[PDB]
Nucleic acid binder design. Structure first.
Lengths: 313, 313, 313
DNA sequence: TATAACTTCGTATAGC
DNA sequence: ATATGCTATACGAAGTTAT
DNA sequence: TATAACTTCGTATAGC
DNA sequence: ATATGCTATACGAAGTTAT
DNA sequence: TATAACTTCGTATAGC
DNA sequence: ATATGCTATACGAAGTTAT
């Protein structure tokens, strides 16, 4: 680690890449480094046949193609940055990444996706929570409403500041995102409750969402945001609420997570006949391929042909 | 052939590729081989300037760019498989495939597409056949209904087994495909007739469609399916029924073929304002590019701007 | 120039490329040539490190990535044509084009787009012009109608010949384009006025639009078309009409231009829930990516989620 | 004449 | 999220008629 | 104290 | 049908307050 | 027998 | 606007039953 760490420390501007990206670079580098160590190989610069065997090593441990792509990519970076040929540009490496994929496009392994939080889900949760006078519930129900209505990422929701909210037609809220997002009358109402009870509106620089301790005492803040982990947890808790704990099969997506609402909303708009430009606008997509992929798991069956044949649309 | 044949025979696992693919590999190889023979050239490994002249040869005979791409691709495979450089990776080859295309993107030659079997077509055929008490007609009308309603390929339709059928809302049938496909009330009814008269439901392992000999006697079966050729022929016959024989201009798509219903349905859904996700779901597409291309010949003119301007939508 | 010019003069068939393309080739070549001159460098064949410094030179002067891509592309052509390696295929060149882009995808510089002429705009213009008895106004209002209704490019509109017009359902006009474009009842009416007053229908080979001099006297013609510059000017004038002159900030798109109607119409159809195939048909697009990009600036906010949640669609 | 109302051009840049 | 190729518009300015 | 209700982390992997 | 790059979430677990 | 109504095939080419 | 890979249909013709 230290070695991995201190060696790096350079790339002049940390700011050259994202903190999220520097994080992954380190993990990979640490990973690659331990391996090279154990197997007595040269860490940097990296030899292709070694990179190739390192990926195979990842594959042989059960890692996704996407995870392997990651380790490869960060490795490619180091080299590229430090002005050296890219492991990727190595017949050996090219070849493995190809062998590894086929192996699974064949194998039937495909990228997963968060368990959808759809309208039926939202409705049910409201049936259970709308009446609650518990701060936590008032907060979380508003959070889910926004998540579902706006399709924003948890990192976007967490950074909403009270000053980002305005009103539009019919008094619905308007949330400005670095883009503007409109809430329905009902979601606006839930958010207004969270707002009146919480106190966040006391300082417009206050983040719309904040902690609520066991006291049930809220703690508005313009400097600290609820972690994305916390937001994930609201999803999970809510899941638990209606379905009880999860089995220990150890696999992802057994409960709702941070993308559940973005996934579900997308599916809801698609199943409802909504057009691609509108869908794109609802979630802020700019690529048709990216959005169509994101909705790769439409879960209802729309019977466009039945409708057409029955002339009943 | 034999030489072409027996030399191949290897690729350890036939199963490595599809039977349809091994078929094309052989044809090409036979083609390439005869040419090399006649022109005294080395068949394997293949020399680029020779591959290049072999493609030009295909072009100079009237073959489509897609057919040339095929011969090239199989040739590329052999080499790749047998661990050798890909003719494709040869300046000479790269260059021709480029020259050859331009030559036609210019030339105005474009990929064809099956003659569409659309709702108007389906309706007309029903006007003619619905009343028939002829087994053949009861069968074929049900086949066309499924083909149009579901947009399934002929190879998918041919492998439907009676046990793949269930019911849904309003008693409409549900056909499970390795995905589920819902039929409208009317198509379900046509299929039910075919089912009651044919006897296929006697053994649930029975393929939904089967032969009907000159006797008019059906022959249900769980081991043998109607060939895709036969299904193509139903399309053709039906075409002939309403338009009489085809001219001997010798060109493809003069009558309906196996894709006519998939093509037509797609066009019908597109002309009707149906959204891309729904269209995608109706035909089981996952790529937006692939579906938009497939509907490259929308044949009605939708006047979205006229509708918008006339505020009459 | 002369040197640039006369050296070129070859490419056997001028017809090998478009006149618009030969125009750009010359400009670039003239540009590149002057630079090479000033900086004492070899014009042809071109050395990569020189090409690289020439692009940097363009960047260092404020030119768009698209403009740089152009100079690069024409340069690549010359070489390619004259059977030489492509500057593009040069580590140095590859690298700059990459550095230059990042520099702006980062920089926030993005391709611009013409100021939209949308339905609200069309309506307003009609409020102002419909009553006019001025030839110029009768002409221009019809031109804008066609531009908006059909989404055709100015070079397509300019080449419409009176003989390209037919009628359809309800007596709406049908304009055949090398494709057929239908006008609404109202736009057809505006065009009919322009037609009756102008005299163009006297010779069916007459271009639908023609000059109208200060006399107010039209000059129908089957040999000369209104320049695309003129059409651009109608857009500008009309803009000026409702907003007065433009500031001298010197930037593009301060007033309506030739693409304003194609842009606006597209946005209008998108905001209205119209499907992608229909949108594609309205503007004659065949690529989903190309159309989605073209509508990268949807300007209204459709609230598909609000509609869905309010069950009010 | 003077001028509108164009056309022609050349560099810059969007869109298929 | 993405590069590279050909063809189109953007627009100020200079040249052209028929007034 | 114990604890809820967080935050911080690190490996794994989805999505723009 | 498709590769490769950067940035985001997924989630168990270990650390942190204010009860 | 003759024949319909298939199946099998092989080259050509569309579609995922 | 775009190349390249694998798998499917297109269709005339020759072979196969059960009439």
């Amino acid at each position: 680690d230290e070695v991995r760490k201190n060696l790096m420390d350079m790339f002049r501007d940390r700011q050259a890449f994202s903190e999220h990206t520097w994080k992954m670079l380190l993990s990979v580098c640490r990973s690659w480094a331990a391996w090279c160590k154990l197997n007595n190989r040269k860490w940097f610069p990296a030899e292709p046949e070694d990179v190739r065997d390192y990926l195979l090593y990842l594959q042989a441990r059960g890692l996704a193609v996407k995870t392997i792509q990651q380790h490869l990519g960060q490795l490619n970076m180091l080299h590229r940055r430090s002005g050296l040929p890219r492991p990727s540009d190595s017949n050996a490496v090219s070849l493995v990444m190809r062998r590894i994929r086929k192996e699974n496009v064949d194998a039937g392994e495909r990228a997963k996706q968060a368990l959808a939080f759809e309208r039926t889900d939202f409705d049910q949760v409201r049936s259970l929570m709308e009446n609650s006078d518990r701060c936590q519930d008032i907060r979380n129900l508003a959070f889910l409403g926004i998540a579902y209505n706006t399709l924003l990422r948890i990192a976007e929701i967490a950074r909403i500041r009270v000053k980002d909210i305005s009103r539009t037609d019919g008094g619905r809220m308007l949330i400005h995102i670095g883009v503007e997002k409109a809430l329905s009358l009902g979601v606006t109402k839930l958010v207004e409750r969270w707002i009146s009870v919480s106190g966040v509106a006391d300082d417009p620089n206050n983040y719309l969402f904040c902690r609520v301790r066991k006291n049930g005492v809220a703690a508005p803040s313009a400097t600290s945001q609820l972690s994305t982990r916390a937001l994930e947890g609201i999803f999970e808790a809510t899941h638990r609420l209606i379905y009880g704990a999860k089995d220990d099969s150890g696999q992802r997506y057994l409960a709702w997570s941070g993308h559940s609402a973005r996934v579900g909303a997308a599916r809801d708009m698609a199943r409802a006949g909504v057009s691609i430009p509108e869908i794109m606008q609802a979630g802020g997509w700019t690529n048709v391929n990216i959005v169509m992929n994101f909705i790769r798991n439409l879960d209802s069956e729309t019977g466009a042909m039945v409708r057409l044949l029955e002339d009943g649309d």
